[PDB]
Amino acid sequence: SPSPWDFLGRVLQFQHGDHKRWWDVLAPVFGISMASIGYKLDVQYRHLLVLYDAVIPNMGPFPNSNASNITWTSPFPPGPLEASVNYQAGESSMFRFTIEPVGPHAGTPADPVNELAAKQLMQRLGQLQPGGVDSTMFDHFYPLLCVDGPEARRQWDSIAHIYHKCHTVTALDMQRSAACTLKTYFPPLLRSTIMNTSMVDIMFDAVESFRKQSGLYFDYTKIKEFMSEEKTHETMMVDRSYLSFDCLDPAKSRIKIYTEAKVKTLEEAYSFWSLGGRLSGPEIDYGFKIVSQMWDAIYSKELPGGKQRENNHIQINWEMSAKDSSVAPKLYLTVIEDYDAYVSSAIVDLFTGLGWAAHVQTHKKIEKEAYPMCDANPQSTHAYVWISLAYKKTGPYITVYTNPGASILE
Amino acid sequence: SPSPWDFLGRVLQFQHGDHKRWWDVLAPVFGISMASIGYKLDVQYRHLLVLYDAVIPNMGPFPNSNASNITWTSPFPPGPLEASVNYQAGESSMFRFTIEPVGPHAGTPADPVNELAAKQLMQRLGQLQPGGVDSTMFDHFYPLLCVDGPEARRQWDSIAHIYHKCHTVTALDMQRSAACTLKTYFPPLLRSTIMNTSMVDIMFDAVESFRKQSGLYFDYTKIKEFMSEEKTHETMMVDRSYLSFDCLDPAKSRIKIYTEAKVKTLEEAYSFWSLGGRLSGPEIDYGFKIVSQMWDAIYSKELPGGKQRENNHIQINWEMSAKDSSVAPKLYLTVIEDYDAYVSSAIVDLFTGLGWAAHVQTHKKIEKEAYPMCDANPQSTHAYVWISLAYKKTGPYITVYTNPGASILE
Amino acid sequence: SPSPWDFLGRVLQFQHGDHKRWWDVLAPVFGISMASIGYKLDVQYRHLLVLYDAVIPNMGPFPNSNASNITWTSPFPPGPLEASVNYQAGESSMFRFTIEPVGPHAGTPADPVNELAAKQLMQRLGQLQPGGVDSTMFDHFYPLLCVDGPEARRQWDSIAHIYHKCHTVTALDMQRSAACTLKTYFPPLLRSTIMNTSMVDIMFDAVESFRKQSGLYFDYTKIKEFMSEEKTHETMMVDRSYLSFDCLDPAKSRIKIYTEAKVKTLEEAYSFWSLGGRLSGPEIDYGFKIVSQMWDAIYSKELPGGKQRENNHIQINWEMSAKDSSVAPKLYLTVIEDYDAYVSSAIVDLFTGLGWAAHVQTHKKIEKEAYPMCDANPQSTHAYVWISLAYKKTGPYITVYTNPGASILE
Amino acid sequence: SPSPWDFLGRVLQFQHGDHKRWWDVLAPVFGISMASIGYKLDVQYRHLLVLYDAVIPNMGPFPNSNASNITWTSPFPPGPLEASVNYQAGESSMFRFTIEPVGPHAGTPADPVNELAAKQLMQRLGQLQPGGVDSTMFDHFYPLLCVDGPEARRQWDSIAHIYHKCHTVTALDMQRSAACTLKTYFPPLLRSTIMNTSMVDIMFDAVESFRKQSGLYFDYTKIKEFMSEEKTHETMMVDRSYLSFDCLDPAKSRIKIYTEAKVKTLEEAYSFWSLGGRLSGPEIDYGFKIVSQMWDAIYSKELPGGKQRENNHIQINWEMSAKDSSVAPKLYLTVIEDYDAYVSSAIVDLFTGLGWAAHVQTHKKIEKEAYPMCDANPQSTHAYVWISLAYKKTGPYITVYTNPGASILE
Ligand SMILES: CC(C)[C@@H]1NC(=O)/C(=C/c2c[nH]cn2)NC1=O
Ligand SMILES: CC(C)[C@@H]1NC(=O)/C(=C/c2c[nH]cn2)NC1=O
Ligand SMILES: CC(C)[C@@H]1NC(=O)/C(=C/c2c[nH]cn2)NC1=O
Ligand SMILES: CC(C)[C@@H]1NC(=O)/C(=C/c2c[nH]cn2)NC1=O
Ligand SMILES: CC(C)=CCSP(=O)(O)OP(=O)(O)O
Ligand SMILES: CC(C)=CCSP(=O)(O)OP(=O)(O)O
Ligand SMILES: CC(C)=CCSP(=O)(O)OP(=O)(O)O
Ligand SMILES: CC(C)=CCSP(=O)(O)OP(=O)(O)O
């Protein structure tokens, strides 16, 4: 019997050819990932139909021979920034994928700031699951962190120098229950540039506004104190920081503060992991043990093409709970420019150490079926992009990000 | 969680508005029928996507306020001729539905004979399940029984008087396995009219051609002998007869000869059931017991609107096996112009007598959910159209046909 | 040879059935109007393709039997608020039409404020004519007068009582040169309600902001003085006022302040026409002569259905020039609930008095061909909606608005 | 102002991505050709909308990187076999284009013979211009010359060895009046192969059938006599012959018999031009003078890549008139594998000799704008495919065929 993506691509009508190309590229990947996780055929159908109706129409142009049609400049290759499978204890695995919503004419004089794509995506997604998307947090943070179209157009000279004029990124957690949780990431770089204000200060002022406007405890003291220090700024690129929240009931949602850091040593990794020792506990220690393990497993190996390793690029988030003052970190090792073989082997060794044999097989299956380049090309550099590490009191929490449009790069 | 047809209508893109209207009308019905049978959500998705891609684009215009857009004249209301659920022993239930493939411009000077709709439908269906549709029998019988476009256009004056210029009807058995078996019905009335030849003779000459060209035993002696008799012609409308075959491997397919008969008594029913006593056996006797039961259960009641019952309209088929000389009948009681309440009650009493309680509940559920008019309007005349009765050696075989576009008539 | 709308509807593919229905209704009307004006076939093709790509996808649902699908509440019937032909001296005639951009799911929990429709329309329109749409004025006035989605959702309780939650209306002047000038109307009623601020004050503060931010003289002293008076408020509904500007180069654009007034006498008409005598000159006098002529020609006749005339509903604008302190009025007689025969006859008598015989014939032709109900039904109340009167130094300036979806009401 | 194809591609919605790609390739070419001829913008719009609705959906897959999606094998590159501009005396120029209608799944088990594409194209074309397409001749010749799907499938083993299983080709004359005359070409090679019958005999038996069935004089004596001779068969490939007729009123239509011949000398050219001297007159002499001129102008030059010229590939038709016994020839010099520069220069010298300066400029303009490769690449071999020469009593009749998808080959 045909797999859901085969049959769907055979039947589905596509409003645009770019949607058909994006489907051909991604539906195999997303469906193979869901199927290896264990999603049910009806759930695969629902989620692939979501990807067809809400998402792909908001992926933007499909890159051609020379990528002449990609008018929306970005460091990331066109398409989903990632397609990830989270792995937790108890054979828990959830498929999720992130997209920067891009319009068909973003970057051009008609949509120079790509304002409508994310809103269209959210509208479609709420129409497909009425009641699943709550815009309370989005409605509070969109004026504070994001720059609407009119503002960006009036204040263009202030942001025209910026290469990636990103203002809102959307991730869709794709639950085994066919429910899609929308997550919104706001990089306020445009906001800071227009207002000429510290990133830290505007982000945390927005969080505090939401605190007082909602009555929810989002403890941001430690994060602000650490991120304001000068030592942190030596390594921490704050121009690359962004805020995230789940588009749910604020009492059931979260606030996460992300930032980028190019560090050289594990002590700087701990600087970003524990907020200068401010955060403490057994979970911090265990998570950093796992982080050091994967550090010396991945960044120990030689870089492709005999290029020396200047420094280890990492991202980091700190997750604030609405119920409690808890701040919990999640470290993201960037492995885009590394051997997919070494990344895969490090993941496998980590899972094997954690006793996650089923996750080992799921990961190998997803790599083999959805990412054939990894085995076909020993020198592959286009599948994995990030390895997230966290240790919740449930246990380890490791997500493995992958470029779902690696077929385009190979 | 939404039902497959809700979600699909929310996501699916439709090439034409008529397809959207037909979907709104039928997908509820077809999906409720499949779901009450027990089809799996993935199977419902696949079958509704088939109905979206292959079928509905070949249903023709959707009837408007005044049915001004129905340029393809037909006795049947626009849409599927039926949407049926077969009921056999052992809680066996299969959903199937019949369509006369109509084009968007059938009946107009561009498609005055509606030649391409059925071929397009078969092409799409084979593209969606390559290897499921075998055209051996279709390729043999299409020149013999059906009239292509060029012929009909050259020989128009011979057939212009005909009201329903039907030449090929397509039924889709919708298996629980997501496989759709295509069945083709050929009314050669146009063929006979152009060639000025007996219906009986051309149909059975085609069957005999196929016999000698295939080496398969399709015993048509008894059927021909009975249908040639003059007594039969007093009741039997032969202008309304047609041939059917399953579009499968001829060694795994069948040949069925249908005809219409307006009879008054059960002895004429037996005339058509047993081919003037030529067919015999316990199955014939039991099947006719069931037929007489439903005869005196349905045609005993008074007709709606105090209109007297002139005669009992029936159809009948005789099924020839490729493996054996067997001829087996299937009698179709026409109950389109009768109280849907009385038809439903007769079905329920029949099933209860057969011990088919589960089928009783399935039938009541399908009526309540997919056909609300039956309970809302005591004087309903727009749900049921046919009751097929047969007795295979497996046991009783009762199909219950229903106008799936009854929402349009009420 | 077929007319452009016939052929186009025959060839064009429509993304949705509602677009096909809207086309069937409006393309005849718009095309007949353009053709009676004298637009060239290529211009008709271009403008109807604009109406197909940019507009109709932003008209919203097509009203069904019971208008159950119109989830966006509005006093106006669904569709274009008007389809107008302006008539000036020298046989100058320009086709234009106004639309309140509505989304497919406006009024529902997904788009409770209809935020994206107007922006999508402008985006498409700029993509179709890059460089024709300038958003300087839109970018300045959108935050001041319009309420974005997040704000409206946070401040819902303040505006939930409002029936027509309109915030931006788009008119497309459809030039004989195939160029479409976009005009944006901002009713800040939601803005005033959320901020609990005077309509007059916020509108004119926005205008003054634009003055100081642009260096363009938009004299709003007389308008503000008149509209602030208490006598004016006795007749003037200020809850119904709105601002308009042409989406062009601000030095080549305009600012117009509209308001609604239910007056009884011609002295109140002059109150609104001359801003309490503040505006003066020969043009004012001549324009008011024409206004009184049409007043006593139209509002003199009896209302349909023997309903007595409580008061004469009028709208009024005052047009400020970027080049000069000029304020010029345009009075809009509302004739929606009046005999289309009497309105047509008044228009004809006016044109005949002005010597506009060619416009008389153009108007009669448009009425006969695009609005057959006017002749078919003597008691017609569904074609004309407004009669605008102005007297520029060029000469008289009379626009005649018509419900282009009158086919739906009759 | 944008050109019709620019604006149309900006607005039009495309049912499939292949249609969008084909549009991007061809609409520029077709529109530039029409515009250089002098077609009016409304006519360009109508004809490009025809190419969008009827044709491109019946061009088949768009060739990808490796032409893996071209499942319908053919000697010709995918797309229109040609896009031609006929040039006659008096600055008379018409654009016409030929297409072999291919389905989206032609060559696959679903449409192994590509049966529905041509019929769909004719249906759409008649729907767009009801009364323009007359199927009398098509209805007579389709059973005689063409092989339907069922026959080809039953008789597959007889034709499976054939590489190009072509059975019907459609050309659209695109008149300056926006009317599209459909022309159907029937290569009966499949018919002859299945029936194992001479091409000559079946073609001319069909023509004679039509004669007796219509009362129209189609003199085929000379053509049959010549084509039956053995000397002709030494050069004449009869496996490559085909019949053509205009899909109009038979009394206003024509019958043309085409064949392919690989000849070496001008005396063989005259053999095919005059039917072994059977045809005579001043027109024959003048036409052959022009043919010899272009022979020694084009085939005199060296072949690209230093490949020696084995023989001169030509096609030839003989046009029979329904009104008269006239047989008139049209010789087609095949110049696909020759320098587009030399072909263009020969065309220019010919036109200059004929006094057709305006045609010279039209041809150079079409080459420069629609075929930039000719000037950009001196060694171009992908623009011109045929040069037709005829001499009607009106005067010379020279058509210049060009691969409209040359952008794909370069
Ligand atoms: C796109 C960037 C401007 C910005 N920075 C990131 O690296 C990022 C990636 C990401 C991966 N999964 C979720 N978000 N998110 C952002 O918002
Ligand atoms: C449509 C008629 C011309 C013709 N006669 C019928 O009554 C018929 C109905 C049917 C119901 N289920 C399957 N076939 N089939 C036919 O071919
Ligand atoms: C409530 C709104 C519809 C608001 N009110 C109006 O009467 C109006 C109509 C209109 C006709 N032509 C142009 N505008 N414009 C608006 O913005
Ligand atoms: C496609 C071939 C099977 C066959 N042979 C040809 O060369 C031909 C080309 C053509 C150019 N313009 C019109 N016809 N036509 C045919 O039917
Ligand atoms: C890997 C990057 C840069 C972003 C991470 S977002 P996430 O997807 O890690 O969020 P969760 O906390 O896993 O929901
Ligand atoms: C009820 C009518 C008129 C047609 C019957 S066809 P069928 O659907 O009975 O065929 P099967 O023998 O059930 O496959
Ligand atoms: C008739 C109503 C209510 C609105 C008028 S807008 P307009 O269309 O009169 O604008 P112009 O000044 O004619 O451009
Ligand atoms: C040259 C190719 C091979 C076929 C020629 S068809 P045609 O376009 O020349 O037909 P006309 O006689 O020009 O109508």
**DSSP string spanning C344-362?**
HHHHHHHHHHHT-HHHHHH
Mutate to test the interface with D, among C49, C56, C123, C129 (most CBs of D within 10 A): C49
Interface A-D, measured as beta-carbon pairs within 8 A, has a size of 17
Chains that touch C (3 or more CB pairs under 8 A): A, B, D
Shortest distance between the Cα of B196 and any Cα of chain D, in A, equals 20
Closest alpha carbon to C326 in C200, C211, C215, C221: C221
Question: How far apart (Å, rounded) are the C-alpha atoms in residues A37 and A409?
Answer: 25
The enclosing H or E element of D201 equals: helix D199-214
Question: How far apart (Å, rounded) are the C-alpha atoms in residues A319 and A324?
Answer: 11
Q: D186: number of CA atoms within 13 Å, CB side?
A: 29
Question: How far apart (Å, rounded) are the C-alpha atoms in residues A62 and A17?
Answer: 9
Look up residue A81 and give its two tokens.
């920034």
- How many angstroms does the Cα of residue C240 sit away from the middle of ligand 3? 9
- Tell me phi and psi for residue B355, to 5 degrees: 80, 20
Question: How far apart (Å, rounded) are the C-alpha atoms in residues D391 and D287?
Answer: 5
Distance of CA C197 to the CA centre of its chain: 25
Question: How far apart (Å, rounded) are the C-alpha atoms in residues B276 and B49?
Answer: 45
Residue A96, classed as helix, strand or coil, is: strand
Closest alpha carbon to B154 in B190, B187, B117, B120: B190
Angle at C171 between CA C166 and CA C177, to 5 degrees: 170
Q: Does A14 touch chain D (CB under 8 A)?
A: yes
> From C1, which residue of chain D is nearest by alpha-carbon distance?
D178
> From D64, which residue of chain A is nearest by alpha-carbon distance?
A65
Contact of D404 with D29, CB cutoff 8 Å: yes
Look up residue B352 and give its two tokens.
């209860």
Q: Is C274 a pocket residue for ligand 3 (Cβ < 6 Å)? A: no
Q: Which residues pair with D243 in a beta bridge?
A: D186, D257
Closest alpha carbon to B363 in B37, B28, B25, B3: B37
Contacts for D396 with CB less than 8 Å, ≥ 6 apart: D88, D89, D286, D287, D290, D354, D389, D390
Question: Can you tell me which residue has the tokens 């700029």?
Answer: C126
CB spacing of C148 vs A148 below 8 angstroms: yes
> From C179, which residue of chain D is nearest by alpha-carbon distance?
D1
Give me the amino acid identity at C203.
M
Cα distances from C216 to residues A68, C181, C251, in angstroms, run: 40, 21, 7
Closest alpha carbon to A314 in A349, A350, A265, A356: A265
Residues within 8 A of D (CB atoms), A 18-37 only: 18, 20-21
Look up residue A347 and give its two tokens.
């993941």
Closest alpha carbon to A334 in A401, A386, A294, A290: A386
Contacts for D197 with CB less than 8 Å, ≥ 6 apart: D191
Neighbours of D61 (CB within 10 A): 23
The enclosing H or E element of A308 equals: none
Question: How far apart (Å, rounded) are the C-alpha atoms in residues D89 and D77?
Answer: 32
Question: Can you tell me which residue has the tokens 């020993």?
Answer: A378
Question: How far apart (Å, rounded) are the C-alpha atoms in residues C222 and A233?
Answer: 57
Question: How far apart (Å, rounded) are the C-alpha atoms in residues C340 and C375?
Answer: 9
Q: DSSP H helical segments within C215-281, as ranges?
A: 221-228, 230-235, 266-274
CB spacing of B14 vs C17 below 8 angstroms: yes
Task: Show residues of chain D in contact with B245, CB under 8 Å.
Answer: none
Closest alpha carbon to A27 in A60, A49, A2, A57: A49
Question: How far apart (Å, rounded) are the C-alpha atoms in residues A128 and B351?
Answer: 40
Cα distances from A328 to residues A85, A207, A208, A222, in angstroms, run: 20, 16, 18, 11
The enclosing H or E element of C259 equals: strand C254-263
Give pairs for B224-230: CB < 8 Å, separation 24+: B224/B200, B225/B275, B225/B276, B225/B278, B226/B271, B226/B275, B226/B276, B226/B278, B227/B200, B227/B257, B227/B259, B228/B200, B229/B276
Strand runs labelled E in D79-234: 82-88, 92-99, 169-174, 180-186
Look up residue D145 and give its two tokens.
């010359």
Q: Which ligand is nearest to the CA of B80?
A: 2
Look up residue D343 and give its two tokens.
């072909």
Interface B-C, measured as beta-carbon pairs within 8 A, has a size of 17
Closest alpha carbon to C400 in C119, C95, C85, C124: C85
Distance from the first to the final alpha carbon of chain D = 29
CA Rg value for chain B: 20
- How many angstroms does the Cα of residue D318 sit away from the middle of ligand 8? 11
> From D112, which residue of chain B is nearest by alpha-carbon distance?
B123
Question: How far apart (Å, rounded) are the C-alpha atoms in residues A251 and A216?
Answer: 7
How many residues are recorded in chain C?
410
DSSP for D211-257 reads: HHHHT-----HHHHHHHHSHHHHHHEEEEEEEEEEESS-GGG-EEEE
Contact of C383 with C403, CB cutoff 8 Å: yes
Look up residue C35 and give its two tokens.
């053709």
Question: How far apart (Å, rounded) are the C-alpha atoms in residues D126 and B110?
Answer: 6
Q: Is D259 a pocket residue for ligand 8 (Cβ < 6 Å)? A: no
Question: How far apart (Å, rounded) are the C-alpha atoms in residues C356 and B211?
Answer: 83
Q: DSSP H helical segments within B109-229, as ranges?
A: 116-128, 136-145, 149-154, 156-159, 189-195, 199-214, 221-228
Question: Can you tell me which residue has the tokens 């078969």?
Answer: B122
Question: How far apart (Å, rounded) are the C-alpha atoms in residues C135 and C248?
Answer: 7
Give me the amino acid identity at C96.
R
Question: How far apart (Å, rounded) are the C-alpha atoms in residues B404 and B30?
Answer: 8
The enclosing H or E element of C335 equals: none
Question: How far apart (Å, rounded) are the C-alpha atoms in residues C318 and C220?
Answer: 9
Cα distances from C368 to residues C298, C376, C377, in angstroms, run: 20, 9, 12
Pairing of strands A82-88, D169-174: unpaired
Question: How far apart (Å, rounded) are the C-alpha atoms in residues C305 and C369?
Answer: 26
Strand runs labelled E in B204-269: 236-246, 254-263
CB spacing of D42 vs C46 below 8 angstroms: no
Interface A-C, measured as beta-carbon pairs within 8 A, has a size of 69
Closest alpha carbon to D171 in D181, D160, D186, D158: D181
Question: Can you tell me which residue has the tokens 């819902």?
Answer: C156
Dihedral (Cα; C388, C391, C392, C394), 10-degree rounding: 110
Contact of C388 with C334, CB cutoff 8 Å: no
Tell me, what DSSP letter sits at residue C53? I
Question: How far apart (Å, rounded) are the C-alpha atoms in residues A41 and B253?
Answer: 31
In units of Å, what resolution does this entry have? 2.7
The enclosing H or E element of B354 equals: helix B340-354
CB spacing of D21 vs A17 below 8 angstroms: yes
CB spacing of B11 vs A53 below 8 angstroms: yes
Task: Show residues of chain C in contact with D1, CB under 8 Å.
Answer: 177-178
Distance of CA D126 to the CA centre of its chain: 21
Question: How far apart (Å, rounded) are the C-alpha atoms in residues D61 and A16?
Answer: 16
Question: How far apart (Å, rounded) are the C-alpha atoms in residues B173 and B97?
Answer: 7
Residue B283, classed as helix, strand or coil, is: helix
Cα distances from B91 to residues B33, B286, B332, D100, in angstroms, run: 15, 20, 22, 53
Contact of A399 with A315, CB cutoff 8 Å: no
Look up residue C41 and give its two tokens.
């076939």
Closest alpha carbon to A81 in A168, A2, A9: A168
Give me the amino acid identity at C85.
V
Contacts for D372 with CB less than 8 Å, ≥ 6 apart: none
- How many angstroms does the Cα of residue B108 sit away from the middle of ligand 2? 22
Question: How far apart (Å, rounded) are the C-alpha atoms in residues D112 and B377?
Answer: 51
The enclosing H or E element of B327 equals: strand B327-334
Over A135-165, what HEC string results? CHHHHHHHHHHCCCHHHHHHCHHHHCCCCCC
Residue C358, classed as helix, strand or coil, is: helix
Helix axes of D340-354 and D282-298: crossing angle, nearest 10 degrees: 140
Question: How far apart (Å, rounded) are the C-alpha atoms in residues C27 and D177?
Answer: 23
Distance of CA C362 to the CA centre of its chain: 21
Distance from the first to the final alpha carbon of chain C = 29
- Tell me phi and psi for residue B339, to 5 degrees: -70, 120
Tell me, what DSSP letter sits at residue B17? H
Contacts for D256 with CB less than 8 Å, ≥ 6 apart: D243, D244, D245, D317, D318, D319, D320, D330
Mutate to test the interface with C, among A127, A159, A184, A214 (most CBs of C within 10 A): A127
Q: Is D81 a pocket residue for ligand 8 (Cβ < 6 Å)? A: no
- CA D296, D298, D301, D305 dihedral sign is negative
Q: Is A184 a pocket residue for ligand 5 (Cβ < 6 Å)? A: no
Q: B405: number of CA atoms within 13 Å, CB side?
A: 20
The residue to mutate among D244, D335, D386, having the most atoms of ligand 8 within 8 angstroms of its beta carbon, is: D244
Shortest distance between the Cα of C151 and any Cα of chain A, in A, equals 7
Contacts for A335 with CB less than 8 Å, ≥ 6 apart: A298, A343, A384, A385, A386, A387
Neighbours of B59 (CB within 10 A): 27
Question: How far apart (Å, rounded) are the C-alpha atoms in residues B133 and B122?
Answer: 8
Question: How far apart (Å, rounded) are the C-alpha atoms in residues C145 and A375?
Answer: 59
Contact of D184 with D169, CB cutoff 8 Å: yes
Q: Is D362 a pocket residue for ligand 8 (Cβ < 6 Å)? A: no
CA Rg value for chain A: 20
Cα distances from A179 to residues A131, C83, C278, in angstroms, run: 11, 44, 63
Question: How far apart (Å, rounded) are the C-alpha atoms in residues C123 and C116?
Answer: 10
Distance from the first to the final alpha carbon of chain A = 29
Shortest distance between the Cα of B239 and any Cα of chain A, in A, equals 38
Q: Does C16 touch chain D (CB under 8 A)?
A: no
Contact of C269 with C290, CB cutoff 8 Å: no
Q: Which residues pair with C328 in a beta bridge?
A: C319
Question: How far apart (Å, rounded) are the C-alpha atoms in residues A70 and C247?
Answer: 28
Neighbours of C410 (CB within 10 A): 14
Question: How far apart (Å, rounded) are the C-alpha atoms in residues D405 and D388?
Answer: 20
- How many angstroms does the Cα of residue C115 sit away from the middle of ligand 7? 23
Cα distances from A403 to residues A139, A258, A382, in angstroms, run: 30, 20, 7
Contacts for C334 with CB less than 8 Å, ≥ 6 apart: C313, C314, C315, C385, C386
Q: Does A157 touch chain C (CB under 8 A)?
A: no
Give me the amino acid identity at A3.
S
Chains that touch B (3 or more CB pairs under 8 A): A, C, D
The residue to mutate among A86, A98, A320, A385, having the most atoms of ligand 5 within 8 angstroms of its beta carbon, is: A98
Q: Which residues pair with D327 in a beta bridge?
A: D320
Dihedral (Cα; B351, B357, B358, B362), 10-degree rounding: 60
Look up residue C282 and give its two tokens.
């020969």
Mutate to test the interface with D, among C39, C42, C56, C180 (most CBs of D within 10 A): C42
Question: How far apart (Å, rounded) are the C-alpha atoms in residues B95 and B175?
Answer: 7
The enclosing H or E element of B269 equals: helix B266-274
Shortest distance between the Cα of C336 and any Cα of chain B, in A, equals 28
CA Rg value for chain C: 20
Contact of D9 with D19, CB cutoff 8 Å: no
Q: Which residues pair with B316 in a beta bridge?
A: B259, B331
The enclosing H or E element of B58 equals: none
Distance of CA D106 to the CA centre of its chain: 21
Residues within 8 A of C (CB atoms), D 120-139 only: 127-128
Tell me, what DSSP letter sits at residue D51? I
Look up residue C103 and give its two tokens.
């989304």
Closest alpha carbon to D402 in D323, D335, D308, D354: D335
- CA C222, C225, C231, C234 dihedral sign is positive
Shortest distance between the Cα of C5 and any Cα of chain D, in A, equals 11
Give me the amino acid identity at B274.
S
Distance of CA B87 to the CA centre of its chain: 15
Pocket lined around ligand 7, Cβ cut-off 6 Å: C 171, 315, 330, 332, 386, 388, 399, 401
- Method by which the coordinates were obtained: cryo-EM
Question: How far apart (Å, rounded) are the C-alpha atoms in residues A64 and A18?
Answer: 10
DSSP for D303-359 reads: PGGG-----EEEEEEEEEESSSS-EEEEEEEE-TTS-HHHHHHHHHHHHHHHT-HHH
Neighbours of C249 (CB within 10 A): 11
The residue to mutate among A247, A256, A258, having the most atoms of ligand 1 within 8 angstroms of its beta carbon, is: A258
Q: Which residues of B186-202 are buried (b: 16+ CB within 10 A; e: fewer)?
A: bbbbbbbbbeeeebbeb
